[PDB]
Structures are given as structure tokens and as C-alpha cells.
Symmetry: C5
């Protein structure tokens, strides 16, 4: 079993695709394994760059193909390097950029708790042929959190484990176990933009929506709630066009539904106040003065949604 | 006839293009055929990776080109592997990512019933030269349905059949039959977002649209229906900008037309009530109180749309 | 002159770019020419796939480069195949995906009549060196027209002609004629979405725009036309955002201009009714009742759009 | 000094990127230079296509790399051709598609005057090594101007000049001059869409904005100007979403600012008319009837904007 | 230690991605190092272009891989050139286009201060193997500042430094230092578009928002502020759709929040004026005439935001 020491150097985690549950990762892979001793020019370790690496493999150099399990398609591999030592150790260094996938929950947006995962595994050689000895990640990202979209919390979580495939029958009997490196980087979304530019103005719309009961005439009370309805429609459109596309409702999306409900409940109460009478224009002095009845009731219903 | 055993491993089905009727599929193809016995180093099966596969074909290795019939262009092929056994059998393993096409009906959106199809067929060799012995699909997708956009129902449906091409005249007479693998994965769309953020608020708009008949003055009844008209225009824009682009009307699209119709029917009645008179301001004592006449009449028209 | 028999197999015509006048075509090219007799293994025709085709050309195989005249850049060529026969005939089969250009008129949108053209011509060899013997197209597209964006009407139109280039002076004197295959597939756009979701609601906006004259007060008649103006602005935005981008006005675009004109003509007449008086509040009992004068005048302008 | 005769064949100029100041050009490059006499099969000129061109260079064929100075990145090169003559002359023919850059002014949009420039220069060989003998452009574009976005005015402007680089010190002393071909194609933008769908309706908005003074009550005069303000906001959004993104204001953008100003000037005058009094509601007869004072005054300010 | 002289020629800095903190840079890299003296044909320096460069490396030419540290993925390399001199010196010239990353603060938008950075470093050879002797940048960009999106201040700031990597343990002990070239081009954003098309009209919206107190009736004062609220919602949407996407609020974004606050403060004051009474309709003659109280108070709060 060939012992391979891996080292991942994370440079940038960007471009989060909410619908595809994808994120772009730029970095470097450093794989090291000790092979048969070589006769390098002089005695110092020989360096093999990009094109020449392929030429050495053709001659007989064993360079194992290590695949990213969670990568979407094939990653953009930059500069390649092979450092061949006279004692036998071979070091493979290459820059990479790939789109990685992971199960991502954006239900409690914009207060997300997401972890960026990286999964490495040899494509052809099993645990008895190729084994991952040790792995260390270097996230050289520090300071200027208020400028970046995401706030990296942990240093990096690593786990080397043997993955067993079910496959059913096939040609390989017992040899069905592969060593896999799992890298996890926990992060929290910056809600400073969404709180001030989306939560705060929406809150004022719903608050001003309750000020419709302070009107004197029934015609005034009803016609204003139609403008109020149009304001939430105009805001729902403003939200959905800028906010990320998702197959489920978020906290901001739920606030919009609560806004529509608040206006529709007001529409029903304004009609009920004027028509549930004993003469014709007998507006219930208590139900017309619900200026404090459901506005605090909205806070009660709003806190039920949190539970 | 060379018997080839195929095995498809589905990893992710994402990125549904509604207009192009396309979907992205990430997975692995495993093709196995038994050839002439080889002399592998030692006696254990020899592994050939990526670049070296092309070198072996140049020497004389028969690797048949198996084409994806329903793929859009050329797929992104990842790591390639050739496992050559001393007994003869050859196993080809390669990761793939391609955009696949299939006839997709999105008429009853967001309650769609779609099946993701995969079609494999040899590009050059016919059924008498190359035959597909057996095929098995492994959809290792389970749990977290409420997070994913689509809900995979069935395990995977397979069908190996001989496809005969019409062509007319040409050079090949009887040899015009090819073995084809057809993989079908049935799925249902998650309507939780579209029901709460699009169906539910739209329903409230139409419900509040009928509350225009609770107004006393004709001037009030007419001017409010113009604001109501503008609300549906603002909503129709909010819908079409977020909803997928299609060459036919959906359930949500039909609801919008019903909204325009309900306001236009009101506009005609509000004019008729005030102008069809015996004195001048004689608003037909019963037609003006149609606060329950067409709102349930809309539901009756809404039940006719079920047919 | 080498006689080459071509056969095009159309799979999918999609992705129409209105501004660039481009459309994506997926299919197969089958070129056949009779050469010098060969000694194939055994006696059965030899099959050469992808990578190996390039190896045969290096040895001395003549494979002519046939260029798509109307293609935008270079097309995505899939699997390649060379079928070499012992009698001499050579068959080249390859899957292709390319963006093709043609003069496209979208003036009478959404009732467009467009033809998808394909132009094939040898890149280096003239009509005296390479001649196209015959060409046949196979459009294996049938049923489910209501699901597809475009409705293919004609089966396929083909034309082999000799194209003469002007060039002026140069090195080649008489040899300036090349054989060209021109494939034409006529299609009609599906107007079901645009008629119900764009033509029908817009018609109701203009129809409800003429209901402004049924108002009693001049203040009511003027203030409502400002809301009417805002409704067309909101609709013009809804139209232009979803509708394809073009450097000329369509039928739907012309309808929007007619809407703006109808409201502006109303604004002028409402002012003219109130102020062309003999006291101050002398509103013309016939011009204020133009409730039928210009609404049918709009229909007369609509009939002028036909001429 | 090698004399090279170049011939550019323009097929299509499309996809103008206003922010990047880029445009896509599809065509053919024909370069001719006389070399040492060759022994071609028979005596007729030998044709070398695509892959085989690289093989001939490896043997010792001198094919100079001619770079497009104003191209953005690397262009999409189609079919390549080398016509080797027994007398010595070598003709290089290749199809190209590239994104070209040029200093573009879109200040007086949609009535822009833009010229599409193409710059060719040898990448390695200077004017003493490689000289451009002559250049001729063939713009085979004619008729259907009303369908195309841009209207080509001139045939083609060509200029061969020696460009001297400053560089400072370096290794090359006197040898710092390179021959450069500059191709210029002048074109005027089709304003038919922008005049009818953007200039004309905007003009009606500002014209109807002045009709706010024809209202009787001060409350009516003020509340209507708020709807007028909202109409320009809705139009400014409709304009900016469809119109190209630029780092400077256009004629249409300036018209929008003039619209905001006209409404804000009206707001100030309506307040001043009512509050600058001697009793309370002493609305200045002349200042309230400014229905003709600033509407023509706007035309006077509008004429200053042109001159 | 090999002394390498580098020269960067900047052609265009465009396409600033605010969310990814990326910018596209087009230019040329000129690397020079003195090797072992060669024997070139004749005596003049030998030129090696594109494909042939790879052929020379295979034979034994040492061409070091110089990587762009801050580049996003792999850059689009154009034409490549190797000028081999008989005295020994080797000059590598190649055109490049890459997306470069740098820490970018867009908090005080549109009055941003940014610097475009370029970082070069050898991928395999350390400071003891490869050393950067000198670096000079040529920004041939001058005049037409009012047309370009950015105004460049300096010529080009350069800094050659030895970067030491932490790595921890590994195989390399002392040899962990690499020479790095840092290029900085300081720039200031052109705010002429954003000041006239976004700051100026928004200022008029807030200024006209304070004109709601000039209304006589309480019903008029309240209903108009709802239209005012809808105007800011329509403007907030117009702003966010055109303005760049960022994870933090800008000066323009803060102005929008101030607009919502000004209307909400007015809503509370209009309700307080009418309901805080001694009879019923006792509107406080001073608090209703706050037509000058908070409008200048808004300017005071506005001046605090600047500090
Ligand atoms: C020769 C026996 N073979 C079973 C077909 C070994 C296990 N195997 C494969 O050969 C095909 N490739 C893989 C495989 C190997 C590495 C990474 C991803 C894979 F799908 C595989 C996958 C699963 Br799930 C189950 C078995 C499996
Ligand atoms: C020599 C075998 N040949 C008869 C001439 C098979 C028929 N054929 C082609 O040769 C071109 N290529 C194909 C073809 C073959 C395999 C896969 C996809 C193809 F388009 C083809 C397509 C159709 Br539809 C009808 C016939 C057909
Ligand atoms: C050697 C003859 N040559 C003189 C330079 C003229 C033929 N020619 C070309 O060699 C470049 N390619 C083409 C050409 C060849 C095949 C298909 C399309 C083309 F534009 C061409 C086009 C025109 Br228009 C005029 C000349 C012409
Ligand atoms: C060969 C000697 N050399 C000086 C080291 C010539 C000058 N030169 C270059 O070598 C790099 N390439 C080029 C050069 C040549 C052709 C096309 C584009 C280029 F940047 C160049 C550009 C400028 Br500005 C100034 C000098 C210059
Ligand atoms: C054998 C010593 N080893 C240290 C782990 C080599 C140095 N190295 C790499 O091989 C991986 N690539 C790099 C590296 C090399 C060139 C440019 C950027 C890099 F991250 C690197 C980065 C850091 Br931080 C630390 C070590 C380091």
C-alpha cells in the first residue's frame, strides 16, 4: 500500500450557486509518495514542469490520478509540477480551480450556516494499493470580514476514512474499499446588506400598513389598503429579482406572505366594520379602533413562526 | 457479436432548461467486454489511466466509441480508466458531465411530472458487431427532498432494444440495426415555493379584487378597479421575471388571465349599473350588490378549467 | 472531379438568437467518395474512430475539409468515424453542433415565418477538383408541436449549385467556382403563449382605457388617465423584459405605442371638453360622450396596420 | 524584407458590447509571400489542410504569426489552409472569429457614429524582416438595412503604416519598427426602434406632465404630480433595463433628468401659487395658468441641450 | 541564482466584478534571462513561435513557469515567442488575458478608490534558483478620461520582494523563499453617471417627500405619503437592478434607507398631529407646519452620515 501525504492550500471560496448547491474553490494540491531511488542530474532534486510531466509518464513514471468526488465536471488545472528526489520521494504540485457540490440548506436566509466541503479519492487504486497517510489544509484567509460575502469561522476540519462501495456482483470481489480525504470549512453569511436594505424597509412597509385604521372615512380606509397591497407586490418583485433563486421559502419570503395576510385581514375587517351594523354606517367603535389589536397580534403570530 | 455489460452511476441531476428541454447529468460509465488474453505485469490486472489509454489504442487496443444519443453537443469527460485483465476482459471507467435532451411537458406547472432519460448506443458498430448484454443504474440519491428542487421517485427504469434506421438506399443493406440502452428516472417538482410565494398571494389579489363592490360611490367603484388592474400588471411582471420561460401558458399563467378577466368583467358591470338607469344615478338595486354573485361565479368558471 | 455524396441528419433546431440572427443545429454529416482500392483486414470494411482518423491522414489518407459557410465560429464536433472499404469508397461520419446564421425577419412577431438554412462547401478544393454528386436531409422530428417553441412545416429543401467568387485579379484565374449544398427548413413560431399572456391582456388594458369617458367629473376623468398612462408604462416594461431584444418594432411593440397615443389623445380631448366652453363648466355633451367615437377609431387604425 | 500581401473578407460584424467597447467580427485572412521554389506532386500547387500545416512547420516551413492587435484574447480560428506553389509563393487561408476592441463614444445615443477597426501586425518579425506589401478588404454586405442593427456606410478604409515602439533600453536597439495594417469600417446605428419605442412615448409622458396645471383644486394639482413623479421612476426603470449599460449619460438618459426636473419645478410652483397670497387661497391667476409658460420654456431649454 | 528581467505591458483594465472582487487585464509578459551561448543560423538571433516553443523544451530548453498568484483560474495566453540569441540570452514574449483578484472596498460607492494589482512568482524555482532582477510596467493609457469608467492616478507602482511560506515541517527546510513581483495601478471611479442619473433624481424624491406637509386635509396628508412610500420602493428596485451587487450597503443604498425613514417619520407625525388633541381635530399649528423643521433636520442627519 502506497502511503500518499496530501496538502491542500485554499486561496479563495467564491461564487455560491444557491439553486445548483455549488461553490467555486481556488487552491493547490500537494501529493507526496516515496518511490524507487532515482539518479537526478548532479544530486539535487529534479524539477519537471507542465508538458514534460506527460513525457515522463509515457517513459514509465507512476503518477496516480486523484479525483475530486464532489467537483462538478472537470476542474481548471493551472501549472503542474513534479519534484523527483534521488532518495525516491515524488512530490506533485498543481494549482486548481473547480466548482464543488455539497448539500446546502438556505431555509433561514440571510442568517445561513454553510460548510464548504472538499472530497479527494484515488480514481483507480483501492485502499490496499493506495492509502492516504496524512492531510493538512491551509486557509490563509484572515481579516476584512465586513468586506467579504462569507465569514469563515473554523480553521479547517479534516477526516481520512475508507469508503466501501455496494456495486453488486461485478469483477472485483473483496477489493472494494477506497481511502477518502474529506475537508470541511464552516462559514456564516454576512447579513449586514440584507438586514438594512431588505429586512428594515420591509418592516416599515408592514408597520405603515397598520396605519390604515387611523383614517376617518370607510372609503379612505378601503382605497388606501389597495395601494398598500400594490406596495407589497412592488416590494415582492424588488426582493425576488435581487435575492437568490431557491425551491423553498426563506425568512424574507415568509415576511412578504405575512405582509399580504396583514393587508387581506385589514380588508376583511374594514368591510366587516361598515356592514355589520344596526342602521347602515354603524362602525363598531372597538373593531374600527383595532389600531393596537392586531399590530401587536402580528408580533405574537410573528414569534410563532420562529418556534 | 461483442457482448458489452454497461453500468451507469448517477451522482447529480440538475440545471433544467425549460425552453431547450435540457437537464445536466453527472455520473460514471462502466463498460465491460471480454477479448483476447493478455500478459499483464506479474499476473494482477493492469490499470491504464487517461493519456496512456490513447497510446494503447494507437498500438492496437479496440476501445469502441459509445455515444450518448440524447446529449447536447459533447460531454465533459473527467478521469478515464482502462482495467486490462490477463484472462482477456477489458473494463472502461470514466466520469462524465453532459447536457441531455428529452420531450418535457411543463403545462401543469409547478406540479410537473418529468422523467430524465439517458440513451446509449455504439457510434460505429451495429447489433451484429456490438451487442449490449446487460445494464444497471445506481441512483445513490436518498433523503433531504425538501432541500432539493426535484423529488426522485422511482429507482431507475432500463430498456435494451434494437433500433433500426430507415436511411433509404445507401451502401449498408441488412446491417442497419443498433443496440440501444434507454435509462429513465421519474421525478416530481417541489411546489412548496411556488404555492406559498406565487399561488397563495395571487389568490389574495383576486379575492381582494371582488371587494371593489363593497364601495358606495360609482366613482370609488371605478377608480379602485384601475388600481386593481395595475396590481395584476405589477404581479404578472413579478411572475414572468422569476418563473421559467415557456412557449405555452401554465396554471399560474392561466390564473393571471383569470385575474385580468375578473377586473374587466367588473369594469363593464360598474359602468352598466350606473349608466343603465331610469333617472340617472339609478344603480340597479340588486346588480350593484353582486358582492356574492360573480365571486362564487369565478369559482364556477375555475372548476370548468379542471376539464 | 471527385464526386462526394452528402447526407445531413437534423436532430434538434433550438436557441434562436433574435439580435444576432443565429440558431443552434445538432446533427450528423455523412460524406462518401470513391477512392483507390484498399486491402482491409480480412475483406470486410475497416472502421477508423476519432483519434485514429488523424493517424491515417498523416500516413496519406485524403480527407477533404468541408466547411459550413453560415456557421458562427467553429462547431462542436462529437464522435468521428471513417469507414474504409476494400473496393475504394470512403465514408466519413461525424456528429456536429453549431450556431448557424441566416437573414431573419421578426417584424410580424409573434406570427413569424422563419427558415433555418445550412450551407456546405469544400474549403480548399474547387468544382473541378471536388463536386457534390447528391444531398439528402433527414428531419426525424414529428408530433408534440404544442410543446415545442417552433413548428417545422416543410420536410426539407435542398439545392446544389456552383458559387463563383469575384475576388478581383489574385493568383487563381478560371478556377474560381465551388459546389455548394444549401439546406432550407421552413418553420412557424408557436403564438399560443404570446396571444394569451401578452396580446389578450394588453387588449383589455386599451379597452379599459376607453372607459375613462364614462366618469362624471372632469377631475375624475383627468386623474384616472394618469393612472392609465402608468399602467401602459408598467406593461411596456413587462413586455420588453420578457420579449426578445430587436432593432425594430414588432406588432406587440406597435400596440404599446397605440396605447400611449390613445391615452394622450384622451388627455387632449378631456381638457378640450372642459375648456372649449361658453361659460367655464360647459363640457361637450357629445365630445365627453366620445365613449364610442375613438374606441372604434382605434380598430380603424388597427385595420390601417394591416394595409 | 519579406513582402506579404494580405486580404481580409468581412462576413459579419455583430454583438456590440457598450461597456467593454467590443464587437465580434467573422471573416477570412489571406496572406501571400514568395519563398524558395518547391517540388510539388506532379506540377500543380499542393494543398495542406488544418492538422498537416503544423507537421510542415516542424519539418521547416516558415509560417509567420500575424497577430490581431485590437483582439480581446485569442480568436476562434476555423479551417486552416496552406497552398504551396512550385514557383515558391505560399498562400495561407484561414477563417476567423474574434472580439475586437476600439475607443467607442456612445454619448449621443441612439444617433451614434461608430467605426469598426481591425489591426494586423507580425508578432515577432519587424519591418526590416517582414513588410506588408498591400491590403484589400471585401465587405460583401449589401441590402436589408432596416433588418440589421447597424448601417454600413463606407466600403472599407485601409492604411499600412510603420509603428515604432518606445520600450526604453531593452535588447533590440534600432530594430523597433513594425508594419501594421489598419482596417476601418464606418457605421451608423439604426434609431428606428429607440425613436418610436423610447423617445416618442417619453415625449408624451413629459407633455402629459404639463397637463397637471389644467386641474382646478390645489389638492388635485399636487396629488397628481406625485403620480407623475412615479410614472417617470417607472419609465426610468423601463429605459435603464433595456438600454445598454454605460459609464456616462446619453440623450435618452438626459431626457429622464429633464422629466424629473419638470415635475419638481411644477411641485414648487403649485406650492408657491397657493401659499404666496394676500388672503389664503389667492392662487395667482397668471402663475396658476402657466399651462403655456414653462411647456414652451422646456422646449427652449431642450433646444439649448442640442446646441 | 538565475537573474530574470520582467516587463509587463498593460493594454486594458476592464470588467470589474464587485461581488467576486475581480478585474480583467489584457497585456504582454517579457521575461529575459542569460543562458549558455548558442549557435543560431548565420549569427542573427533565432525566433521560435507558439507550437515550436514546446518542441525546443522537449529537446532540453529551460523555460521556467512563471505563475500569476492573484489570477482566477488559468489566463487566456495568446501568441508565444522565444528569441534565442547566440550570446546566450533568452527572451520570452507572450500576450495574456486574465481575471485578477484583489481586496476591494466598495463601501463609499460611487466615490470609490481602488488599485489593480498584478502578482508574478516562479511556480517551481525558489529565490536561490530563480531571482527577479528588475521589473518595469508600461501603461500606454492616456487621455479620454470622461469616456472611461475609471481615472488612473499613477504610472505603475512596482515591488520585488522575497515571500517566505509557513508550510509547517514538510521536506524542504531552509529553501522556502520565493521572489515575487507586485504591480499596483491606483485608480478613482468616474461618478458623473451615478451623480446625475442616481443621486440627483433620488434627492428630488426625498425633497418632494417633505412637500406632503403643505397639504390641507389630514386624509390628503396621509394618503399621499403611501404613494410617496411606493415611489421609494419603485426607486429602490430601479437602483438595485442597475447598481452592482454587493454584500454591504453603499452611500446610494443608505440614501434609500433615509428615504424610507423620512416617509415613516412623516406617517407618525401626521397621525400624532391629528390624534394628540384636546377636542378631536385639534391639529398642532406648529407640528403640522414642520415644513421646515425636519427637512433641514434631514440635512443635519445627512451631514453626520458623511463624518
Ligand atoms: C471490477 C469490480 N468493480 C465493480 C464494477 C469495482 C467497483 N466499482 C467499479 O468498478 C466502477 N467504478 C466505481 C467507482 C470507483 C471510484 C470512484 C467512483 C466510482 F463510481 C464504482 C462505484 C460504485 Br458506487 C461501485 C463500484 C465501483
Ligand atoms: C453504413 C451504415 N449506415 C448506412 C449508410 C447506417 C445508416 N446511417 C448513417 O450511415 C449515417 N449515420 C447515422 C447514424 C448512425 C449511428 C448513430 C447516429 C447516426 F446519425 C444514421 C442516422 C440515421 Br436517422 C439513418 C441512417 C444513418
Ligand atoms: C489563390 C486564389 N486566391 C487568391 C488570394 C483567391 C481565392 N480565395 C482564397 O484563397 C481565400 N478563401 C476564399 C474562400 C475559399 C473557400 C470558401 C470561402 C472563401 F471565402 C476566397 C474567398 C473570396 Br470572396 C475570394 C477569394 C478566395
Ligand atoms: C527583441 C528586442 N525587444 C526588446 C527586449 C524588442 C522590443 N519589444 C519587445 O521585445 C516585447 N514585445 C513588444 C511587442 C512586439 C510586437 C507586438 C507587441 C509587442 F508588445 C514590444 C512592445 C513595446 Br510597446 C516595446 C518593445 C517591445
Ligand atoms: C517540500 C516543502 N513544501 C512545503 C509544504 C513545498 C512548498 N509548497 C508547496 O509545495 C505547495 N505550493 C505552495 C505554493 C508554491 C508556489 C506558489 C504558491 C503556493 F501555494 C506552497 C504554499 C505554502 Br503557504 C507552503 C508551501 C508550499
Amino acid at each position: 500500500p502506497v502511503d500518499v501525504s496530501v496538502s491542500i492550500f485554499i486561496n479563495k471560496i467564491y461564487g455560491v450557486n444557491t439553486l445548483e448547491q455549488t461553490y467555486k474553490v481556488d487552491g493547490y494540491i500537494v501529493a507526496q509518495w516515496t518511490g524507487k531511488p532515482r539518479k537526478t542530474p548532479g544530486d539535487k532534486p529534479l524539477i519537471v514542469e507542465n508538458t514534460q510531466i506527460e513525457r515522463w509518464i509515457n517513459n514509465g513514471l507512476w503518477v496516480p490520478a486523484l479525483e475530486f468526488i464532489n467537483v462538478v465536471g472537470s476542474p481548471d488545472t493551472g501549472n503542474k509540477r513534479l519534484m523527483l528526489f534521488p532518495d525516491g520521494r515524488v512530490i506533485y504540485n498543481a494549482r486548481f480551480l473547480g466548482s464543488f457540490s455539497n448539500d446546502m440548506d438556505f431555509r433561514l436566509f440571510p442568517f445561513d450556516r454553510q460548510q464548504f466541503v472538499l472530497e479527494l479519492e484515488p480514481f483507480s487504486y483501492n485502499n490496499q494499493q493506495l492509502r492516504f497517510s496524512d492531510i493538512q489544509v491551509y486557509t490563509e484567509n484572515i481579516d476584512n470580514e465586513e468586506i467579504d460575502e462569507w465569514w469563515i469561522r473554523g480553521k479547517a476540519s479534516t477526516h481520512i476514512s475508507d469508503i466501501r462501495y455496494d456495486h453488486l456482483s461485478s469483477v472485483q470481489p473483496n477489493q472494494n474499499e477506497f481511502s477518502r480525504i474529506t475537508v470541511r470549512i464552516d462559514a456564516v453569511r454576512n447579513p449586514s446588506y440584507y438586514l438594512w436594505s431588505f429586512i428594515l424597509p420591509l418592516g416599515l412597509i408592514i408597520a405603515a400598513s397598520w396605519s390604515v385604521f387611523w383614517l376617518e372615512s370607510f372609503s379612505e380606509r378601503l382605497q388606501t389598503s389597495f395601494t398598500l397591497m400594490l406596495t407589497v407586490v412592488a416590494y415582492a418583485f424588488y426582493t425576488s429579482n435581487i435575492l437568490p433563486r431557491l425551491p423553498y421559502t426563506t425568512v424574507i419570503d415568509q415576511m412578504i406572505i405575512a405582509g399580504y395576510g396583514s393587508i387581506f385581514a385589514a380588508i376583511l375587517l374594514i368591510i366587516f366594520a361598515h356592514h355589520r351594523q344596526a342602521n347602515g354606517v354603524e362602525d363598531d367603535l372597538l373593531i374600527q379602533r383595532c389600531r393596537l389589536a392586531f399590530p401587536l397580534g402580528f408580533l405574537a403570530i410573528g414569534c410563532v413562526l420562529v418556534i
